[PDB]
């Protein structure tokens, strides 16, 4: 049971929980948890450029990763949203073994 | 197959367990147990995080807690076990992640600071 | 990836790109920390949590602080100068500086933050 985390930005709350219905409803994530209150930093032609934003954390597979980042994009009101994923190399082998078996 | 040494997510020189608590006093209360036993160096904590998962053929929103424990590899067993016992829950979120590189001084102070 | 190749001999490795997480004292010099390492290009992007709670067993004692969880999303190459840039100006003696690999990501987003360290 090979897990994953992906970490995807949302603008707000709102949307972080559009999107992690989505990809649950699709069965691409076991369970999303969301992170409010972030502030995010970029630097763009010489200026520094701040916002506020949601992280998410997605639940996953390897082999439900990339459909997972695919569904995320699309219904993401960005262009290109951040999204990462990574590795799981350990954890509780029965929630391991719940996450697995809630995926498509 | 491929060996990259400075990426090798598979000797990792420390780890990072998350972990879910369903409010903050039990959160507290988990970290401090798992702190005191030396089985984590630091705990930090992020209350009123959002889960949302399917149980029961139902969509569930539920504020809980989001646990970031940081320890090492030879530790991580023995903090899951830890941590899954005193949780209230049967089955609670336990996943740990690699870390690939960390400051000299800071991977000093976390294995002197566990058991 | 677009290699127009056998699955077996596509994705055979993983980006260059990492995470790094260090907790700040407090909002203000996350931000002031998060601006340094960004205008040095030492990382792509940062993301600040503010307003969290850290816990410790400093001296058998257990310490209870409010802290700031930050994110700086860089790559491998850089990993070593964004932490001696986060250590030298961050007001703890020895400060939690750690690299999480990232596996895979969007390619898109990663060929910006590929690009953003440029
Ligand atoms: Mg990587
Ligand atoms: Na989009």
Redesign the interface.
Same mark, same amino acid.
């Given at each position: 049971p090979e897990? +994953?985390?992906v970490?995807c &930005?949302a603008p707000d =709350?709102a949307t972080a929980?559009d999107l *992690? *219905?989505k990809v649950? *409803?699709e069965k691409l994530a076991?369970?999303? &948890? $969301?992170?409010?209150?972030? &502030?995010? $930093?970029?630097?763009w032609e010489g200026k520094?450029e701040?916002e506020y =934003?949601v992280?998410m954390?997605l639940?996953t597979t390897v082999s439900h990763?990339?459909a997972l980042?695919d569904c995320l994009?699309s219904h993401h009101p960005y262009q &290109?949203? =951040? $999204?990462? +994923? $990574?590795? +799981?190399?350990?954890? !509780?082998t !029965?929630?391991?073994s719940?996450l697995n078996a809630?995926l498509r």
């Open positions: 897990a +994953v985390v970490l &930005t =709350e929980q *992690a *219905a649950l *409803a076991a369970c999303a &948890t $969301l992170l409010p209150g972030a &502030t995010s $930093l970029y630097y520094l701040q =934003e992280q954390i639940k990763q990339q980042i994009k &290109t949203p =951040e $999204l990462l +994923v $990574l590795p +799981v190399t350990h954890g !509780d !029965d929630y391991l719940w809630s």
